[PDB]
Amino acid sequence: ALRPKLSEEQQRIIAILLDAHHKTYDPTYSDFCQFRPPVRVNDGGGSVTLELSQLSMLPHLADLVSYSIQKVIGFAKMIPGFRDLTSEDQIVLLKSSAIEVIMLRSNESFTMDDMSWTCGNQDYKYRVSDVTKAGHSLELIEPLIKFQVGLKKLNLHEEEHVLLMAICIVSPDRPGVQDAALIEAIQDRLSNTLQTYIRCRHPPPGSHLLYAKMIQKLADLRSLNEEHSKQYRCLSFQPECSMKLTPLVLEVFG
């Protein structure tokens, strides 16, 4: 049960990641009014035909996700070591992790009060029924909500949250990476920072096997990523879908 202190480098890594997150995640959601507006058609019956015909929530949620990818790119660039990677590996890591980091960072707006992502007034409160109105199905949405609740209940320190996002991005087991060894070295530096932080700074009982629980959430995210990809592919078969997306979203998920 040794509890080595955080090294000066580890303290700097945490400070950098906290600063990067504070610069790239606006907790007031003040830009969301600039997105194409949310529209909610009457769909109490959960009609797939209606949902695909209208895709009423897709422009807004696509803009939200596009915006969020831009922010994740900015965050990633500040991760210590990320800029030591080749441009090619950086782009592979960003494209493969984008939806996973979006799912992680969204936990900050997720609330167990009513199981929504609450980002302002009623207009920017996103519920499961809004995600079906963007052309996704419960095979993704239901495990996504379970994931959000499981993550929320870890009661992560912001330090742990930003480390987890950085570890998710800098993953040596993404398809198409060149220098897996360098990526693994960067990830290990982050992982060791997180393990050390938890042992130092996270009091019981919330610290109990917390690192293992966090690593399991990274595995859960792979499953969610795969399902999202399959559903995105099917969504994209809808005529005129591309106009409801953005160029960045089309690249990242196409």
Ligand X SMILES: C=C1/C(=C\C=C2/CCC[C@]3(C)[C@@H]([C@H](C)OCCC(C)(C)O)CC[C@@H]23)C[C@@H](O)C[C@@H]1O
State the binding site.
25, 68, 105, 109, 136, 228
61 sits near ligand X (criterion: CB under 6 A): yes
Q: Does 10 bind ligand X (CB under 6 A)?
A: no
Can you tell me the distance from the alpha carbon of 250 to that of 38, in angstroms, rounded to the nearest whole number? Answer: 20
Find the part of the chain contacting ligand X (CB under 6 A) among 132-140, 167-175, 191-199, 212-220.
Answer: 132-140
Does the protein bind ligand X through residue 24 (CB under 6 A)? no
Binder to ligand X among 94, 134, 166, 167 (CB under 6 A)?
134
Binding site for calcitriol: residue ranges?
Answer: 25, 68, 105, 109, 136, 228
The total number of residues shown for the chain amounts to 254
Question: Per-residue x/- marks for ligand X, 64-103, CB under 6 A?
Answer: xx--x---------------------------------xx
* Interatomic CA distance for residues 234 and 231, integer angstroms: 5
Residue 148 binding ligand X, by CB under 6 A: no
- Which residues contact ligand X (rule: CB under 6 A)? 58, 61-62, 64-65, 68, 102-103, 105-106, 108-109, 117, 119, 126, 131, 134, 136, 140, 228, 232, 249
